[PDB]
Design a protein around this ligand. Structure first.
Ligand SMILES: C[C@H](c1ccccc1)N1CC(=O)N(c2cncc(Br)c2)C1=O
Ligand SMILES: C[C@H](c1ccccc1)N1CC(=O)N(c2cncc(Br)c2)C1=O
Lengths: 302, 301
C-alpha cells in the first residue's frame, strides 16, 4: 500500500552528467558516447543574451574554449556543432558509463523524472509532468541549466527534457534533446510568460483510481455520465477535454476496480461542482494531476 | 525557484542492491563490501510468522541455503550471523561499487530517500520522514522488504532505514541498519498498531520559512507568542510540542528572513485556526511537515 510521487532510479543518468564552462558561464552537460549535449546559451554573456546571434558567437570559439569536467577529470573537446537550441561538443573519450538510451519528445500530460545538477554534480531527483502550457513546475536555482528529464522504459533511458530557463512566475522551460523547445519560448533574455494552464483530466482520473485501490472510496457514487456531458463540465473548470483515447487508456484501471471510466467521471463531476466537503484523498485536499494512468499501474502492480 | 519533495540521486545505492532467497521467500538485501544485510524474516515460512524463534530457525541453516544474486551473478555465501532483526551474510566477493558509507539511527522528524526494490532490482525513489509514531508513509508492495532509506550529505551515503513490514493502516515499519526497530514494533505477525500520529511542528515552520524565501508572505501576522502558549494551542491540533532545540535549529532560517521563530509560530497558530481560505502555500492546500530545516536550507537559499 501507499501512494507516493515516485521518480525513476537516477543512477544510469548520474553517470552521464558533466560540467561545461565557456567564459565565466558554467552549467551542466550530458555525456553520451563521445558527445556532450548542453544548452547553446553556454556561449553567451549577459550582453549577448539580450539578443544573441548563436551562429556568429559559435564560429568565434575554438574547441579549447570549452572546458569540460567529468568528476576531477578534464575531457578534451575535439569538435563542436549546434542542433536547434542544443550545443553538441565532440570529445576525445567515449563515456564508459553510457547507458542504452533514446531521445524522445513527450506530450503535455506525460510525466518524467528530473535529475537536478549544479557544476555537473547531481543534487536531487524528482517527478514532473509536462503541463498543457508546456512549462514544468520544477525546483531549480542558478547553475541548474542543462539538467535533464527522463523515463526508463526497460533498461533503456528515454531522455525527454533539458532545462534552459526559469519564467517570471517561477516555473521552468526547456527543450527535447534535439534542442526543440517545449512551448512558445526562446533562449534569450526577453519578456516571456507561461500561458494560463489547465488541469490534466485523464491524470486526475488515474489518481482517483489509485485512491480507490488504496482504500479511499468516499467519493464514489451511484451515477454515471457521458463523454459530452462530462466535457461540458470539464471545460467550465479549466480541465482538459477527455477523449475516447483517454477512456481507452484508463481501461485497465476501470477493469481492476469495477468502476467504468464514465462512472469515475461522475465522481469527478461531483468533486468539481461541490468540492471535497472537508475530506481528503490520498492525503491531499486538491485533485492531483501529475500521475499518468501508466504511473498508477506501475506503482500499484510492478 | 520552485519547491519540490526532492530525493537524493539513487545511483550509489542502486549499485548495492541484491536479491536474497531462502526457501520460497525472496526479498532485497544491501551489499556493502563483503556483507549482505537483509531482514531476518527471510528465514520464516508459513508457520513461523506468529511466534518465530529466530535463533532456532537460524541454527538449522547452512550458508548454501542462502541464494544471493547480484544482477546476473550468484554470490557465494561464506558466513552468516544475526544482529537484532537483520541477517548479515558474509559473501565471497566485496562489492566493487561500495560507496563511502555509514549507518545512522535517525530521530522522528528526520527525512530520507527510499529506493523501493523488488527482486534486488530498483523500481523507484522517493522522499519520506520518520513520523512521530515511528512509522513511515511509504509506497511498498509485497517483495519490497529489505528496500532501504538513506541520505547523501556529501559523497557519503548514510543508511538509516531497512523496510520490514506493513501495518494494518497501510503505513510502514522497519529498522536501522544495525537491525533495531524504530518504535515498539517487532518482526512478528501479532496484532500491533501505530500510535496516533502527530504533525511535525518544526518541519511545518521550516516549510513556512521556505515559502517566505520563495516570495510568499500572505500568512504572516503582527502577533507573537510565548513558546508555552504556542505548545498549548498546537497540542489541540495534534501537533508535536516544539522544544528549545527546535527553536535554536530554526535560527538560520529566522536570520535569513528577518522573522523571529515565535513570530512564525504566531502565524502557524493563525493558519491552524483559520485554514487557508482557498489559498495555497508552495502549491499545497495543507501544511507540509516532511521538510526539515536542513532540507529547506539545502534546496532554497
Ligand atoms: C538568464 C538565463 C536565461 C534567460 C533566457 C533564456 C535562457 C537562459 N538563465 C540562466 C540560469 O541559470 N537560469 C535559471 C534556470 N533555472 C532556474 C533559475 Br532561478 C535560473 C536562467 O533562466
Ligand atoms: C508478511 C510479512 C511480515 C509481517 C510482519 C513482520 C515482518 C514481515 N511481510 C512480507 C512483505 O513483503 N511485507 C510487506 C512490506 N511492505 C509492504 C507490503 Br503490502 C508487504 C510484510 O509485511
Amino acid at each position: 500500500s501507499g501512494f507516493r510521487k515516485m521518480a525513476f532510479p537516477s543512477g544510469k543518468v548520474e553517470g552521464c552528467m558533466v560540467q561545461v564552462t565557456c567564459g565565466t558561464t558554467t552549467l551542466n552537460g550530458l555525456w553520451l558516447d563521445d558527445v556532450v549535449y548542453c544548452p547553446r546559451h553556454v556561449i553567451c554573456t549577459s550582453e549577448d543574451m539580450l539578443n544573441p546571434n548563436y551562429e556568429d558567437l559559435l564560429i568565434r570559439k575554438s574547441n579549447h574554449n570549452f572546458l569540460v569536467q567529468a568528476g576531477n577529470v578534464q575531457l578534451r573537446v575535439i569538435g563542436h556543432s549546434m542542433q536547434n537550441c542544443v550545443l553538441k561538443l565532440k570529445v576525445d573519450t567515449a563515456n564508459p558509463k553510457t547507458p542504452k538510451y533514446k531521445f524522445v519528445r513527450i506530450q503535455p500530460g506525460q510525466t518524467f523524472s528530473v535529475l537536478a545538477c549544479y557544476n555537473g554534480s547531481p543534487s536531487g531527483v524528482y517527478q514532473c509532468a509536462m503541463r498543457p502550457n508546456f512549462t514544468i513546475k520544477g525546483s531549480f536555482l542558478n547553475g541548474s541549466c542543462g539538467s535533464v528529464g527522463f523515463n526508463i522504459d526497460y533498461d533503456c533511458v528515454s531522455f525527454c527534457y533539458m532545462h534552459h530557463m526559469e519564467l517570471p512566475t517561477g516555473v521552468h522551460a526547456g527543450t527535447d534533446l534535439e534542442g526543440n523547445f517545449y512551448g512558445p519560448f526562446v533562449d534569450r533574455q526577453t519578456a516571456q510568460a507561461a500561458g494560463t494552464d489547465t488541469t490534466i483530466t485523464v491524470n486526475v482520473l488515474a489518481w482517483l483510481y489509485a485512491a480507490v485501490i488504496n482504500g479511499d472510496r468516499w467519493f464514489l457514487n451511484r451515477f454515471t455520465t457521458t463523454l459530452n456531458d462530462f466535457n461540458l463540465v470539464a471545460m467550465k473548470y479549466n480541465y482538459e477535454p477527455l477523449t475516447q483515447d483517454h477512456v481507452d487508456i484508463l481501461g485497465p484501471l476501470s477493469a481492476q476496480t469495477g468502476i467504468a471510466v464514465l462512472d469515475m467521471c461522475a465522481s469527478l463531476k461531483e468533486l468539481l461542482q461541490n468540492g471535497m466537503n472537508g475530506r481528503t484523498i490520498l492525503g491531499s485536499a486538491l485533485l492531483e494531476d501529475e500521475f499518468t494512468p501508466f504511473d498508477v499501474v506501475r506503482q500499484c502492480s510492478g
